[PDB]
């Protein structure tokens, strides 16, 4: 007696939640420590990390 | 939802705070003392630092 309409469904759902990378800076003071930089020096300065 | 302004930072300082070199004076008094310097004299004197 009914005429069904005849439609179901499905669902999901997804999650973009992060960026994709942190980029962690632990920032250089490089006259450093022990050491001397001098007007019209003339060198190189290292930070591995 | 949101669209990133992708954009991370790192950063370091330099400190410059010498000159490269300190010229101490110790001036010389050249007649010098338990010496003698006379007019028209021809000679030598020296002054090791
Ligand atoms: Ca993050
Ligand atoms: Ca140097
Ligand atoms: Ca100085």
Aim: proline residues 8%.
């Amino acid at each position: 007696s009914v005429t069904s309409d005849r439609t179901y469904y499905g669902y999901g759902d997804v999650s973009v939640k992060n960026e994709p990378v942190n980029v962690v800076v632990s920032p250089f003071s490089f006259p450093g420590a022990n050491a001397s930089l001098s007007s019209g020096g003339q060198g190189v300065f290292k930070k591995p990390d």
